[PDB]
mmCIF file of C-alpha atoms in Angstrom:
data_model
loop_
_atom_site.group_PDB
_atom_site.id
_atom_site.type_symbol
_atom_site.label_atom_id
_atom_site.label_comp_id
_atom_site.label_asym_id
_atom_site.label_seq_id
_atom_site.Cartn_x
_atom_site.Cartn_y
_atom_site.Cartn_z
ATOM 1 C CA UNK E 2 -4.653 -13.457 -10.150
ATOM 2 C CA UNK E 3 -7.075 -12.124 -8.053
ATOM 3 C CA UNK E 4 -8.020 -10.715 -4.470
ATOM 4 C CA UNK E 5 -11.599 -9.904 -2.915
ATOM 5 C CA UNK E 6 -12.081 -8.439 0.292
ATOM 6 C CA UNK E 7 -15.181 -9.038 2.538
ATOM 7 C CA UNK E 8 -16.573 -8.086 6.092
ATOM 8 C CA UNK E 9 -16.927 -4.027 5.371
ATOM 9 C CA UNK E 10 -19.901 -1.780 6.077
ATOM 10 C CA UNK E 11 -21.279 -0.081 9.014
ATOM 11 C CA UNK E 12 -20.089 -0.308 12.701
ATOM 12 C CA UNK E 13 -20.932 1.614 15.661
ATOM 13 C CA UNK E 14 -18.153 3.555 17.623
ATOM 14 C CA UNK E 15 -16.079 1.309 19.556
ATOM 15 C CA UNK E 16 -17.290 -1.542 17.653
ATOM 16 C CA UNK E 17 -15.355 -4.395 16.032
ATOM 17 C CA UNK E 18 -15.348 -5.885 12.210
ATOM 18 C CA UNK E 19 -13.461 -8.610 10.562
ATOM 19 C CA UNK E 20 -12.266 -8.060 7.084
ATOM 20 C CA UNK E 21 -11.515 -11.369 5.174
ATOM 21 C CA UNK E 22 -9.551 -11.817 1.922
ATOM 22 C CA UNK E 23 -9.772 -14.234 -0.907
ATOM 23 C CA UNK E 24 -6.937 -14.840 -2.932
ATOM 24 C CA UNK E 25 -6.480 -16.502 -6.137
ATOM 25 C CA UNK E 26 -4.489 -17.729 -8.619
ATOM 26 C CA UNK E 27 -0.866 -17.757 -7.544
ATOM 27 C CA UNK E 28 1.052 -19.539 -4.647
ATOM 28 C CA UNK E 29 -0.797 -17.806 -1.422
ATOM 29 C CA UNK E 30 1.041 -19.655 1.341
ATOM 30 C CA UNK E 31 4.499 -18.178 0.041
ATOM 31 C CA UNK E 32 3.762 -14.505 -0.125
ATOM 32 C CA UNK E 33 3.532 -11.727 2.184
ATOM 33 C CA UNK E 34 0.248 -9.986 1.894
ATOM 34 C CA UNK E 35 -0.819 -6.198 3.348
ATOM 35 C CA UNK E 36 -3.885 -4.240 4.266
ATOM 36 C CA UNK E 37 -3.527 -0.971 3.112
ATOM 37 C CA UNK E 38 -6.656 1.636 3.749
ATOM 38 C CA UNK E 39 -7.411 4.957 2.353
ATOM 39 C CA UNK E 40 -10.459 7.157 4.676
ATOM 40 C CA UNK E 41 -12.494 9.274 1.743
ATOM 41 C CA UNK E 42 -10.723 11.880 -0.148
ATOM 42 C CA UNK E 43 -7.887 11.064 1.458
ATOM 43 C CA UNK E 44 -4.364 9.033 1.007
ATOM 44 C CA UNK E 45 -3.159 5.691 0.742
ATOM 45 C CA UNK E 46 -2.531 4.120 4.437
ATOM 46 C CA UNK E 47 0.091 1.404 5.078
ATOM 47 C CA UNK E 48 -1.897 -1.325 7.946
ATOM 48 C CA UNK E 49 0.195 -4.063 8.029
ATOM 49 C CA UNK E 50 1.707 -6.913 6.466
ATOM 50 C CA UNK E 51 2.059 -10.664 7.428
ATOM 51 C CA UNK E 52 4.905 -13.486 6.232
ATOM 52 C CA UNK E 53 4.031 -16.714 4.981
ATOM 53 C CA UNK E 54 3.819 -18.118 9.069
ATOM 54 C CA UNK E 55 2.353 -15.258 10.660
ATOM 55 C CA UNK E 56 5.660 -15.227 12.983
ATOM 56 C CA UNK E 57 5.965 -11.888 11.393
ATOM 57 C CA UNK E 58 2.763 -9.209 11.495
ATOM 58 C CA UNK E 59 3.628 -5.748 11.508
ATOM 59 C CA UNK E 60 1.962 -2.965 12.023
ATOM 60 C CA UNK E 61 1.457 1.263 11.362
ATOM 61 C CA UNK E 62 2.196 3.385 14.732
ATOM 62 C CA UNK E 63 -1.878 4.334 14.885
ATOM 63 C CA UNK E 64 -3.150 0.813 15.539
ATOM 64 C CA UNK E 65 -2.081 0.511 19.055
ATOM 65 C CA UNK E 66 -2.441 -3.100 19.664
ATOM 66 C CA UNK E 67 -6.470 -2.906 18.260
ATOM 67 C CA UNK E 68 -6.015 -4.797 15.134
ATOM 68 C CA UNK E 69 -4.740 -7.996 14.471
ATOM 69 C CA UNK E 70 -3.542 -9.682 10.980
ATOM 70 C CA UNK E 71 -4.293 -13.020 10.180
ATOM 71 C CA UNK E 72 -3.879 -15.912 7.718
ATOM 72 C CA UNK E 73 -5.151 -19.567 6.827
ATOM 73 C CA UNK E 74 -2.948 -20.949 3.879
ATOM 74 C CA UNK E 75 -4.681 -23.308 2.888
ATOM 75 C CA UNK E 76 -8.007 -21.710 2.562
ATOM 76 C CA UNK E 77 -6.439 -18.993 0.835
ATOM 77 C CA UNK E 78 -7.541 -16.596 2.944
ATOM 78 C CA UNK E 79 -6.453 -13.108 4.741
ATOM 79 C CA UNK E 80 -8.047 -11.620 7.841
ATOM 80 C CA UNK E 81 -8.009 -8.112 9.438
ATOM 81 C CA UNK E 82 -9.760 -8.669 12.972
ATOM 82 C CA UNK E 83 -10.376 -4.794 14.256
ATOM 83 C CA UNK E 84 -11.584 -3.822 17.754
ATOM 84 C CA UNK E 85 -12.279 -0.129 19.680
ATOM 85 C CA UNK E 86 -13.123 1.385 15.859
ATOM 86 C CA UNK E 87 -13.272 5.099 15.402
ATOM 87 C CA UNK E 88 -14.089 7.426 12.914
ATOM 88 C CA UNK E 89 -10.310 8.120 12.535
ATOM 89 C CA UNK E 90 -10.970 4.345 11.191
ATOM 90 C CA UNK E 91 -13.607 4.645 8.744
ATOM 91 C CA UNK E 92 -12.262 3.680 5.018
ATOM 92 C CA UNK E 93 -11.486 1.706 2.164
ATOM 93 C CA UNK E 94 -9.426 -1.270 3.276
ATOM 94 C CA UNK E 95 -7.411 -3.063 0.306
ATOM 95 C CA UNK E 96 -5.996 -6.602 0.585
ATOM 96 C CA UNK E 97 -2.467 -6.454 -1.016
ATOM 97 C CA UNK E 98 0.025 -9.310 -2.084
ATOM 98 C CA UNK E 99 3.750 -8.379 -2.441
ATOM 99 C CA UNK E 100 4.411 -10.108 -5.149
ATOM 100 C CA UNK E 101 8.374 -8.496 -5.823
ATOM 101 C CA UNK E 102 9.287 -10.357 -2.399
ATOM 102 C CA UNK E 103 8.740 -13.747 -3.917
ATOM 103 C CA UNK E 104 11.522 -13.579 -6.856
ATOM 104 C CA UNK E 105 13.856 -13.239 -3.646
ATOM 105 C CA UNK E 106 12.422 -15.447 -0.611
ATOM 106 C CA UNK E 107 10.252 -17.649 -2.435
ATOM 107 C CA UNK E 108 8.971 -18.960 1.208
ATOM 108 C CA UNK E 109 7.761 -15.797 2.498
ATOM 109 C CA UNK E 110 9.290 -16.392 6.105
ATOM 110 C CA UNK E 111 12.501 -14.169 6.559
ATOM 111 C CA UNK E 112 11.483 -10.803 7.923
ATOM 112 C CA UNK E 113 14.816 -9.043 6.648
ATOM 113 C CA UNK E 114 15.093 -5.382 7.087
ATOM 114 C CA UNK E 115 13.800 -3.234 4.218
ATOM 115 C CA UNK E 116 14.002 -5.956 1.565
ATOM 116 C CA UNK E 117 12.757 -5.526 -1.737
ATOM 117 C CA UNK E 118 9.185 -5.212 -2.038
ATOM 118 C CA UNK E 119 6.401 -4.596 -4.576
ATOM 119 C CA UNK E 120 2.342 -4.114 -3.989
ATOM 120 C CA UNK E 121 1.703 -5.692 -7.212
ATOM 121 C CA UNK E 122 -1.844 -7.219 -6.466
ATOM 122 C CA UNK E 123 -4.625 -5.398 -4.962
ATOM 123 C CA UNK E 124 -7.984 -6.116 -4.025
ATOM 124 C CA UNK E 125 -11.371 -3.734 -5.021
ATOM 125 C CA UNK E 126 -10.982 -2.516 -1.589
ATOM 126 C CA UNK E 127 -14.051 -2.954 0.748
ATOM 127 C CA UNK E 128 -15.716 -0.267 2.985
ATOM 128 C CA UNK E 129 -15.130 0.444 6.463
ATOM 129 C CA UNK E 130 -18.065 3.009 7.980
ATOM 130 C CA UNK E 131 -17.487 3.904 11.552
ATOM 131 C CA UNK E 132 -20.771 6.146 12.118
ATOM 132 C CA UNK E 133 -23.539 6.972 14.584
ATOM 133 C CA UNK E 134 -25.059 8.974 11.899
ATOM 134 C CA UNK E 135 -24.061 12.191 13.122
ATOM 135 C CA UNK E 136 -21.876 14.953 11.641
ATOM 136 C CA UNK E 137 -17.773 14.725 11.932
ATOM 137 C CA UNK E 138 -18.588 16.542 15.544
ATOM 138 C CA UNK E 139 -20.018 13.007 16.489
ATOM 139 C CA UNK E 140 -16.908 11.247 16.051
ATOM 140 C CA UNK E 141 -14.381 10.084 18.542
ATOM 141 C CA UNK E 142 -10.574 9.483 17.833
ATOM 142 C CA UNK E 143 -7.419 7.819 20.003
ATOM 143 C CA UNK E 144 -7.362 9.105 24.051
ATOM 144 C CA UNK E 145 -3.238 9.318 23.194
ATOM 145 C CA UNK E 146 -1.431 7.012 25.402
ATOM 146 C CA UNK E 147 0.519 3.362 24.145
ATOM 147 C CA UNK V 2 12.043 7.568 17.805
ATOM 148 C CA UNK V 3 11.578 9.852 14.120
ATOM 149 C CA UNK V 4 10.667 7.398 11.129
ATOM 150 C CA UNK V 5 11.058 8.197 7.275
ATOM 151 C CA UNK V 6 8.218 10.909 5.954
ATOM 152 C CA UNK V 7 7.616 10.874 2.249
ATOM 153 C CA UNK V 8 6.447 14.125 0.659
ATOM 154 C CA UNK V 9 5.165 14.796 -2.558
ATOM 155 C CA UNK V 10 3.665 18.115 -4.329
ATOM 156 C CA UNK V 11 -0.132 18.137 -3.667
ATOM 157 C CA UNK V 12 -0.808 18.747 -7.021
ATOM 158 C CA UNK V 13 0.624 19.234 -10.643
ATOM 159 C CA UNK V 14 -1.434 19.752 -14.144
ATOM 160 C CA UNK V 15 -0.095 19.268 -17.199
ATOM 161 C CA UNK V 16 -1.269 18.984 -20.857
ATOM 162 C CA UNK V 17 -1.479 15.737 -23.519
ATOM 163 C CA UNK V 18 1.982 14.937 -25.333
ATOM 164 C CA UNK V 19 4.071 16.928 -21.982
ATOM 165 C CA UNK V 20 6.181 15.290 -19.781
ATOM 166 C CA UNK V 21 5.624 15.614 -16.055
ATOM 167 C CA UNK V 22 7.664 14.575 -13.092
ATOM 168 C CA UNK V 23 6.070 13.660 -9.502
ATOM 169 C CA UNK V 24 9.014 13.866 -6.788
ATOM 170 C CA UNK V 25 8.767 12.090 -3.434
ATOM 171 C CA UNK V 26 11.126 13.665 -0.563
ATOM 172 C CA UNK V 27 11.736 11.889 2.641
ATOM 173 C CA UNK V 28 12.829 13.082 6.375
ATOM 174 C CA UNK V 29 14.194 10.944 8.727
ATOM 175 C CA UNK V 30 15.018 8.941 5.056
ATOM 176 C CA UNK V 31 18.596 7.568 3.420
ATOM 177 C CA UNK V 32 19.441 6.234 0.478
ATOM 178 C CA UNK V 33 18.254 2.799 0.979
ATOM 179 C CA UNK V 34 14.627 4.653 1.417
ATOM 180 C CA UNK V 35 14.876 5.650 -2.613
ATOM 181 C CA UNK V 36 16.402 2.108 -3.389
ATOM 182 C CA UNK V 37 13.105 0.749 -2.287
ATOM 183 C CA UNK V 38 10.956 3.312 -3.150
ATOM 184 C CA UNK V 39 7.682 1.979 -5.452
ATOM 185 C CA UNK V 40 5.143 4.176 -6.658
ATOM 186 C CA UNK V 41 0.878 3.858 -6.931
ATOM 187 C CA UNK V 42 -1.291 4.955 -9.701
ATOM 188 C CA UNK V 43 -4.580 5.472 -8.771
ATOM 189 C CA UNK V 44 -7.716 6.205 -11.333
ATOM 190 C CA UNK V 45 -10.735 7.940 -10.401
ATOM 191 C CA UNK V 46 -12.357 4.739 -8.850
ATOM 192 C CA UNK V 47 -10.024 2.338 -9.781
ATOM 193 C CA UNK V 48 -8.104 0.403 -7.321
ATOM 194 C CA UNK V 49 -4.370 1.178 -7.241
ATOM 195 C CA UNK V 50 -1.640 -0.300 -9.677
ATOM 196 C CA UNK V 51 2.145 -0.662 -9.275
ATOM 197 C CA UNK V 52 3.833 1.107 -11.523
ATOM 198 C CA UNK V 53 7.263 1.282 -10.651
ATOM 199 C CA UNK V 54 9.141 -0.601 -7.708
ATOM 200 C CA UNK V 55 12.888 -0.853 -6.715
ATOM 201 C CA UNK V 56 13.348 3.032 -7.097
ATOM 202 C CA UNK V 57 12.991 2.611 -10.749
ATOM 203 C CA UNK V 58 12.102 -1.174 -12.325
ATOM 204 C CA UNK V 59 9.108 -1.039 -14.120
ATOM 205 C CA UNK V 60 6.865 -4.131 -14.338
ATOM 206 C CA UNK V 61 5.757 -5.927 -17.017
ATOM 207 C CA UNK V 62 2.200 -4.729 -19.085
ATOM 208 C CA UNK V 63 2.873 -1.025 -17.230
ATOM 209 C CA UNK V 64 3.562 1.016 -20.413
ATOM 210 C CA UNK V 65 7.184 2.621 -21.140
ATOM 211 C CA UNK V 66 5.613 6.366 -20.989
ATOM 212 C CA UNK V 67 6.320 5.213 -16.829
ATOM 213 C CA UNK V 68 9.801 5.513 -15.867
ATOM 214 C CA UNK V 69 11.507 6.678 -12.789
ATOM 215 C CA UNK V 70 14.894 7.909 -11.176
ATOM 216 C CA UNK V 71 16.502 8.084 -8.097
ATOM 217 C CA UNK V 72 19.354 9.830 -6.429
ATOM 218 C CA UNK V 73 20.492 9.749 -2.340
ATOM 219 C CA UNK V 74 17.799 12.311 -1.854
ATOM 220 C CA UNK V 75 14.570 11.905 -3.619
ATOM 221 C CA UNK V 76 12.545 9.474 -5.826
ATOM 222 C CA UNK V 77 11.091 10.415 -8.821
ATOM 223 C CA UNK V 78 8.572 9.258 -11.055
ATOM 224 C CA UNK V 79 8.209 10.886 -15.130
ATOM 225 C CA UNK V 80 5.276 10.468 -17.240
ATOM 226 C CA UNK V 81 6.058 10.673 -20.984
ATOM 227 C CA UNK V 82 3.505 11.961 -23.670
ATOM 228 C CA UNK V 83 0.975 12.258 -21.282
ATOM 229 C CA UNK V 84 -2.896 11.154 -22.283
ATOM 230 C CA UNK V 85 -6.324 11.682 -20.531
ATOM 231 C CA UNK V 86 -6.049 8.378 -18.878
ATOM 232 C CA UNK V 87 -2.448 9.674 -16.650
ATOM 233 C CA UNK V 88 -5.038 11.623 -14.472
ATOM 234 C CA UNK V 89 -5.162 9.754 -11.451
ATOM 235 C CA UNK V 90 -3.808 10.387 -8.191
ATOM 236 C CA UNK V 91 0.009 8.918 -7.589
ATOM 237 C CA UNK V 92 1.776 7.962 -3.986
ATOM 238 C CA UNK V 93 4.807 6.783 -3.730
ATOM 239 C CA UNK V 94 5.756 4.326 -0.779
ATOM 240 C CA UNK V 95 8.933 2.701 1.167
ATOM 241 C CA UNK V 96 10.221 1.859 4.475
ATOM 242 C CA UNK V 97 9.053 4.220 7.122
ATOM 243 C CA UNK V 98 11.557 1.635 9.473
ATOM 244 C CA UNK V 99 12.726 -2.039 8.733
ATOM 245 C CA UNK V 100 9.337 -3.365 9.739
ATOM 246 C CA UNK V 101 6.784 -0.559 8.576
ATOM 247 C CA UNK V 102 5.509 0.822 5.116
ATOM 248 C CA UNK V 103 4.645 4.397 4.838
ATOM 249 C CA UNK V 104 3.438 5.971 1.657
ATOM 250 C CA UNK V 105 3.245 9.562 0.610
ATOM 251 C CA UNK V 106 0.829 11.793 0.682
ATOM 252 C CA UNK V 107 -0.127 11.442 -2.623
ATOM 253 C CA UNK V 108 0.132 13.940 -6.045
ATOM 254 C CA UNK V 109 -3.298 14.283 -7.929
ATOM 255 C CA UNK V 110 -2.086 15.001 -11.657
ATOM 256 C CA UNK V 111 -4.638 16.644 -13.491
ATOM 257 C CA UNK V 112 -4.583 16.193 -17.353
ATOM 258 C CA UNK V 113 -5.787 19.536 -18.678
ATOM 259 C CA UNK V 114 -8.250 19.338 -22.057
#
C-alpha cells in the first residue's frame, strides 16, 4: 500500500501547480482520499477530500473556490489543481486515503454527515514553494472577501 | 456560522518508562466530535501515522503503549512507558462540520534523555 505525490516545487505569486497522486495497492476507485498540507514548522492542514465519483469534493474555509480536487479511477490517480497561490500556500501537501470509511461504505459514494473516518495511508508529502525570493515581507495573502 | 476548534497543549516533556497524556479540547464541538476524533503521530521527518481513530480504536501494527479515551468533552490520547522514538509531534483531528476536517494544533512531546 502505497501513495506518491508529484507536481511540487517552486511557483511564482499568483501562479498555479497541479499536484498528482499515485496510489497503490488496494481498491482506489472505492475510497475517499484527502490532501492534507502542513506550511514549515507549522501544523497539520485539512484541504479536502473526494468520494469514489467526485459528486462529493469538499473543501477547508481558506481555499475560496482556488483549488479543485480531482480523480481518475482507473489510472489510480489523485489531483490537486491550485490557482491564485500565495505564500499563505507554500507547504508540504500529503495525499491521504481514508481507509476506516471503507469497512462501512465499501463504494465510497455516500457523503453522510460525520461518518467514521480514518487517515490511515499517507503519502511522503511533496513541496509546495510559493516565493519571489524575497523575505516573508515579499509575500502576499487572501484580499478577504468570498 | 462557528465550526468545531480543536486545542491541544503546545507542548509536554516527559521522561523514558512515564506515562503522558496529550488532550484535545474543542469549541463549537459535541460529543459526536470525540466519537470521531483520530489522532497523528508525526516523527522528525517522517510522514504522519494513524494511531488511534474512532475516539479510541487502535489499529493494527500501532503498538499497545497507544491508547486513548474519550468523554462528552475532550479526547485524549496516553502514551505508556514512553521511549526515545514517542518524540514526535501529535494532532488530533475530527469534524470541524459534516463536510470538513479540522485538526489540532498539534502537541510536540519531547522525550527528555
Amino acid at each position: 500500500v502505497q501513495l506518491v505525490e508529484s507536481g511540487g516545487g517552486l511557483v511564482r505569486p499568483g501562479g498555479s501547480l497541479r499536484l498528482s497522486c499515485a496510489a497503490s495497492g488496494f481498491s482506489y476507485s472505492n475510497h475517499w482520499m484527502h490532501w492534507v498540507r502542513q506550511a514549515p514548522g507549522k501544523g497539520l492542514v485539512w484541504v479536502s477530500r473526494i468520494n469514489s465519483d467526485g459528486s462529493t469534493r469538499n473543501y477547508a474555509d481558506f481555499v475560496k473556490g482556488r483549488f479543485t480536487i480531482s480523480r481518475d479511477n482507473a489510472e489510480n490517480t489523485l489531483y490537486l489543481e491550485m490557482n491564485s497561490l500565495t505564500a499563505d500556500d507554500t507547504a508540504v501537501y500529503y495525499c491521504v486515503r481514508d481507509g476506516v470509511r471503507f469497512y462501512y461504505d465499501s463504494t465510497g459514494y455516500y457523503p453522510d454527515s460525520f461518518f467514521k473516518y480514518g487517515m490511515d495511508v499517507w503519502g511522503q508529502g511533496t513541496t509546495v514553494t510559493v516565493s519571489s525570493g524575497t523575505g516573508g515581507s515579499g509575500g502576499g495573502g487572501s484580499g478577504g472577501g468570498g | 456560522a462557528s465550526q468545531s476548534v480543536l486545542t491541544q497543549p503546545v507542548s509536554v516533556s516527559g521522561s523514558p518508562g512515564q506515562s503522558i497524556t496529550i488532550s484535545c479540547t474543542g469549541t463549537s464541538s459535541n460529543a459526536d466530535t470525540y466519537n470521531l476524533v483520530s489522532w497523528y503521530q508525526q516523527r522528525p521527518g517522517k510522514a504522519p501515522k494513524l494511531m488511534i481513530y474512532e475516539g479510541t480504536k487502535r489499529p493494527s501494527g500501532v503498538s499497545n503503549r497507544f491508547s486513548a479515551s474519550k468523554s462528552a468533552t475532550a479526547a485524549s490520547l496516553t502514551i505508556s512507558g514512553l521511549q526515545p522514538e514517542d518524540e514526535a509531534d501529535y494532532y488530533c483531528c475530527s469534524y470541524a462540520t459534516s463536510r470538513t476536517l479540522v485538526f489540532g494544533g498539534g502537541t510536540k512531546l519531547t522525550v527528555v534523555a
